[PDB]
Amino acid sequence: NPAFDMKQINALNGHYQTMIDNGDLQCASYMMSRGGEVFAAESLGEFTGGQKEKQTFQLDTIREIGSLTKVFTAVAVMQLVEKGLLDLKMPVKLILPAFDKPGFGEIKILHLLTHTAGLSFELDIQKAEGIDLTNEEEWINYLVSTPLEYGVDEAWNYSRTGFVILGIIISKVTGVSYEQYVTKHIIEALGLERTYFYVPDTLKEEVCVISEHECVQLEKSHHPYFPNKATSGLYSSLRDIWKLAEMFRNKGRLKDKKLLGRKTVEAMLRNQIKPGLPFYFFGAPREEGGFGLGINLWPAGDHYFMTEGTFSHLGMGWCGMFSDPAEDFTYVFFTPISEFHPHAVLTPLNIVWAGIELE
Numbered sequence: 388n389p390a391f392d393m394k395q396i397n398a399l400n401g402h403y404q405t406m407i408d409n410g411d412l413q414c415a416s417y418m419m420s421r422g423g424e425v426f427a428a429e430s431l432g433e434f435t436g437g438q439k440e441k442q443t444f445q446l447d448t449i450r451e452i453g454s455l456t457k458v459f460t461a462v463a464v465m466q467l468v469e470k471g472l473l474d475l476k477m478p479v480k481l482i483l484p485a486f487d488k489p490g491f492g493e494i495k496i497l498h499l500l501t502h503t504a505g506l507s508f509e510l511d512i513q514k515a516e517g518i519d520l521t522n523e524e525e526w527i528n529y530l531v532s533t534p535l536e537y538g539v540d541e542a543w544n545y546s547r548t549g550f551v552i553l554g555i556i557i558s559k560v561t562g563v564s565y566e567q568y569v570t571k572h573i574i575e576a577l578g579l580e581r582t583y584f585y586v587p588d589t590l591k592e593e594v595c596v597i598s599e600h601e602c603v604q605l606e607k608s609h610h611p612y613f614p615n616k617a618t619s620g621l622y623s624s625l626r627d628i629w630k631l632a633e634m635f636r637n638k639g640r641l642k643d644k645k646l647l648g649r650k651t652v653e654a655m656l657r658n659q660i661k662p663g664l665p666f667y668f669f670g671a672p673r674e675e676g677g678f679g680l681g682i683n684l685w686p687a688g689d690h691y692f693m694t695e696g697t698f699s700h701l702g703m704g705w706c707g708m709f710s711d712p713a714e715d716f717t718y719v720f721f722t723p724i725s726e727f728h729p730h731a732v733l734t735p736l737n738i739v740w741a742g743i744e745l746e
Contacts, residue, residue, distance in 0.1 A: 389426035395742025407432040412724040414444035418625040436596035455702030456621040461681025499549040505537035506546040523614040543666040554617025565615040581624035655680040692740035
């Protein structure tokens with residue numbers, strides 16, 4: 388009825404379990420659905436941050452989603468476009484007057500959402516002495532004192548700072564904090580039950596941590612060097628990231644809950660990058676690839692088994708959200724691991740899509 392070859396579930400479980408058994412990572416979990424109905428989900432392994440004995444990784448374990456936070460930021464921006472409070476062709480300087488200067492004055496909201504604003508990947512916090520980088524105005528002023536790496540619409544260059552700026556813009560036009568906005572209008576609005584910018588004290592013991600850094604950050608109430616958590620920092624769960632992916636696949640709604648109109652989602656899932664633009668990632672050139680309004684359209688097609696049109700975002704940590712509208716199919720996963728490893732993060736997608744059968 389899901390029309391899925393369950394021998395591929397056995398293969399998927401053994402793949403993750405083998406990496407766990409060999410010490411490549413501590414734990415892994417996944418959730419997969421057809422037509423909005425989860426038919427396979429599993430959690431494997433155990434976790435420890437180093438300070439207590441290993442704990443079983445469960446399907447409802449809370450885990451930081453890293454880069455996947457940017458997808459929440461993208462939805463928030465687009466909700467404000469639906470309200471008429473933002474237009475993607477607005478120059479950033481219209482909202483943040485510090486951008487009213489050469490170079491920065493050409494950046495439009497659309498550029499930030501598509502990683503084409505010319506911003507570098509990161510800001511060097513080591514050179515911000517005497518600046519409180521958790522203060523919005525001090526962070527913006529530091530940002531605009533640092534040279535742009537490219538002009539606008541010259542390159543796709545994945546940028547953390549682009550989405551911090553989007554968080555500030557969200558706060559400025561709504562009159563609440565970025566986190567308050569997303570919590571009300573996306574997290575609560577979609578019925579996400581284990582998703583938090585800051586995990587309640589009573590639930591912190593149910594959070595997967597695999598390193599000293601993660602333990603320390605779980606106890607903090609702010610991001611260490613950004614004024615918001617719009618680029619990274621959300622904690623979530625499989626089911627909640629599954630709901631987010633399904634919301635996109637269903638073009639903006641999940642049963643009775645509606646976050647976006649269908650025409651808005653169609654725009655978000657359409658390639659927005661000028662063809663021929665070079666792609667850079669963390670300094671290195673990357674294969675061209677479609678990119679939507681904060682949503683990745685690669686990997687898809689080509690030698691992958693995911694159908695062209697599959698949309699996704701990976702999250703540092705690592706985790707991932709993949710949804711293939713042509714097969715009514717969604718796969719979300721957590722592979723907590725200290726360093727990206729394609730055998731853990733990407734190769735399992737082959738196993739999964741190879742099990743899809745004709746409905």
